Write a protein that binds this ligand. Structure first.
Ligand code: 20N
Ligand code: 20N
Lengths: 471, 470
């Protein structure tokens, strides 16, 4: 069973002996720090952490004893705020005396703005604000996945609109194949749910359950998939029988869309000879609601995609759309699911555009690039103390390392506001109290062990829409 | 509650309909495919997966119904193999009819060798082998952390041995600060445990419990930490009171080691004037068992370490060790916990060596670089079918993409062997049965719902030792 007393950076266990004596309040904030591109970030994932880990009776006698026993061996010393944890158990029935205020989930906010703040609601628990830094900072992950996923959506929308004249199917153009490429089951669910803020396609089922339990959607599920082969279901037929495997699978799945990996031995032979000749009669007969989707999975991603389209365009009837771009027949599409990240995604669609291929023709799958090849440094996700009260006097605190101005932190009590031009500004030093900038956009979401404001996944999706979708 | 019917890639739900008719056996294997350079990998972490997710009754009526309802909406179609899962429920009381063979955990094996194999033990459950690919493939993560952690130990060992003449304290030279920098609580525990294969220092508490539950150590805990400041415990005193903060903290922790972040405003001032002058009397009085450990945390990592050392060298009595390298007094050390990954670690220790500073003087902390900035591509961790039986005939299967020879997979039944020179070789096409290469080095670790062979964390550590330690 999860124990919040064991869910912090070890050294934090020792911090109740380090703050200035007579400190009644520690107030800290989280930002995606500006770095001297990722100019705006989707705020998502806090509500999961609040419900799964922080809410309700999270302290018990047994949990305190367990922690005491572990830390004694871990430190080879007795340092551990047993009294402090007892106080929360006795006075608040194990509920964290903490208030967290946050921007609504789904909101898209420029770098360098306060996204949430944390403070203790009882003077005795001044040490608790930063105890829970470790667990709260892990919000960097769904924030970064949602943000990086949204940025790939911008690229797709731009090129889809240019080559086709509309955005139809945009929400299916980047599929999550990341289940096997992430570091754990829990990461898989969190990461999949963050991708679903922006798209509807995922093969990692864990994302669905998480969304239902922690956020909720009107639709039965937030995510979808279609029948698809892997290399094992082709190669199991034997090297001389790829055609047989192909024929079997497309016939099994004759009325739904079907993805078939085509590069087991020779992707170009498979497209030109097998699909394009031997089995062409099983492809051209297919419904528009059930195309064959050809899946290359090796080689230079751009070069392979172009050569695959070139091959197919000579074997199947291609049309030219109203924008001047070439379009495969509706029963035939391509998915590139190898080597895809935000950099290569851009290179592929631009390369397709150069060769006059509509983005209508293709969709993308991303695994490690989508859910694993990301770090806290990408958006400089960071949690810092900005305000303390000591001897009843509030003081604005901050770091400002001489060798790195980029690591300077904000001062005092913070608030987030709309500017007169409609942008965002973070006010420091309690200047929000002057009320010159309209309402603070941060809302209380957690207070004294209870979740006080929640968002549905439908609202979050609405908040995270692209401008191009809006327009 | 975790449901293994829902812990696969969505598309694998439809695979029982895609294999050749009358297939009775699917046999697959995992390798770190040969292409840095990461020539050898530590095999670690399968035992966690076996126990937490695969063993015992993993199928119930409720889990079957649950997955049915989920997949119906997910595919917008009824495609779930309800009958197959019911067969396992009814026949084997929900225990998986699967056999897994694996190299011992902690083993250091060159790239391109079979590390584990998977096959169904019941003909009806031919589809089961690749259903669990997704869960088993996540072993890439502990393998890669452990391997990358060990590669850094190799670097530290070389430079420590060169500058000091021994390896004393090596196991504490790379400390895990990755708890906040990983993608989840579960990942934190797994990765920390993998780091602990090589080192004893971690602030990621979750690692200890994982090891205790799934592996076990003779000692009460496998990892240790020491009291340390963060920016909030320095800055909370106010910008004009950094000295007061330093004095309070080193006085509170006067007889244990204490790490004190010193770059809140001006690292160089902090070292030269605050520590080196104002509070010097509180530092030179400390025990060898309780040093002050000064922690810079910003600026170019190499330049910052070198300047911090030059500053301290002029304020405190420096000795020259037997190898001719400079050594701070035993009550004073440094930890660099910013910008550290396998690349910069190398640059820092080489830079220290060039300036005649012993590696004894320093330790490193790494977070995202240690536990998060790694992918399945680093070691090319990959799971592939190599052998099937269809119509009673065994077939050696494989992929071999024309535009990428690096993606070619192995053929047939596999086994791992010791060569005449004492190295590892993987034999394909069932050739291990010819008995020209001695016994198979893989062991059966899982069979029909039971873990059949396991390793303590102490055994794993021993297996993973560096040659220089041996
Ligand atoms: C629009 C589209 O192409 N969707 C789509 C295509 C393929 C897959 N799935 C696969 O290709 C799996 C085998 C990897 C999922 C959605
Ligand atoms: C040998 C050594 O220097 N160990 C060591 C030093 C510092 C810390 N911990 C910290 O510096 C925490 C503040 C980040 C842990 C172990």
């Amino acid at each position: 069973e999860f124990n919040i007393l064991l869910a912090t950076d070890s050294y934090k266990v020792t911090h109740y002996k380090q703050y200035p004596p007579n400190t009644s309040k520690v107030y800290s904030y989280f930002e995606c720090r500006e770095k001297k591109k990722y100019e705006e970030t989707v705020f998502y994932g806090l509500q999961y952490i609040l419900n799964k880990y922080l809410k309700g009776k999270v302290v018990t006698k047994e949990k305190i004893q367990e922690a005491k026993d572990v830390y004694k061996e871990h430190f080879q010393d007795d340092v551990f705020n047993e009294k402090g944890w007892n106080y929360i158990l006795e006075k608040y029935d194990g509920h964290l005396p903490i208030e967290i205020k946050a921007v609504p989930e789904g909101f898209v906010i420029p770098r360098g703005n306060v996204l949430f703040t944390v403070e203790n609601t009882d003077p005795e628990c001044y040490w608790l604000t930063n105890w829970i830094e470790t667990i709260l900072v892990q919000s960097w992950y769904p924030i970064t996945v949602a943000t990086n996923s949204r940025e790939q959506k911008k690229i797709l929308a731009k090129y889809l609109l240019e080559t086709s004249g509309n955005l139809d199917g945009l929400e299916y153009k980047l599929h999550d194949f990341g289940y096997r490429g992430v570091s754990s089951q829990e990461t898989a669910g969190i990461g999949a749910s963050a991708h679903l803020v922006n798209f509807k396609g995922t093969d990692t089922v864990a994302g669905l359950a998480l969304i239902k339990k922690y956020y909720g959607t009107k639709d039965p599920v937030p995510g979808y998939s279609v029948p698809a082969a892997e290399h094992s279901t082709i190669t199991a037929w034997g090297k001389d029988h790829e055609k047989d495997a192909f024929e079997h699978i497309v016939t099994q799945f004759s009325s739904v869309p079907v993805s078939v990996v085509s590069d087991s031995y020779d992707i170009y032979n498979a497209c030109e000879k097998i699909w394009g000749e031997d089995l062409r009669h099983l492809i051209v007969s297919r419904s528009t609601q059930a195309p064959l989707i050809i899946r290359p999975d090796s080689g230079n991603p751009l070069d392979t995609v172009l050569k695959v389209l070139e091959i197919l365009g000579k074997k199947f009837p291609v049309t030219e759309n109203s924008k001047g771009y070439k379009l495969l027949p509706p029963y035939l599409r391509v998915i590139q699911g190898d080597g895809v990240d935000i950099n290569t995604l851009q290179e592929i669609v631009e390369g397709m555009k150069q060769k006059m291929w509509s983005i209508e023709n293709i969709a993308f799958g991303s695994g490690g690039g989508l859910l694993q090849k990301l770090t806290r440094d990408l958006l400089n996700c960071s949690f810092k103390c900005s305000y303390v009260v000591t001897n009843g006097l509030g003081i604005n605190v901050f770091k400002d390392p001489v060798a790195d101005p980029n690591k300077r932190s904000k001062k005092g009590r913070l608030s987030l506001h709309r500017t007169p031009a409609g942008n965002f500004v973070t006010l420091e030093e309690g200047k929000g109290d002057l009320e010159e900038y309209g309402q603070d956009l941060l809302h209380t979401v957690f207070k004294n062990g209870k979740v006080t404001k929640s968002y549905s996944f439908d609202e979050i999706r609405k908040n995270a829409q692209l401008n191009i979708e809006l327009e």
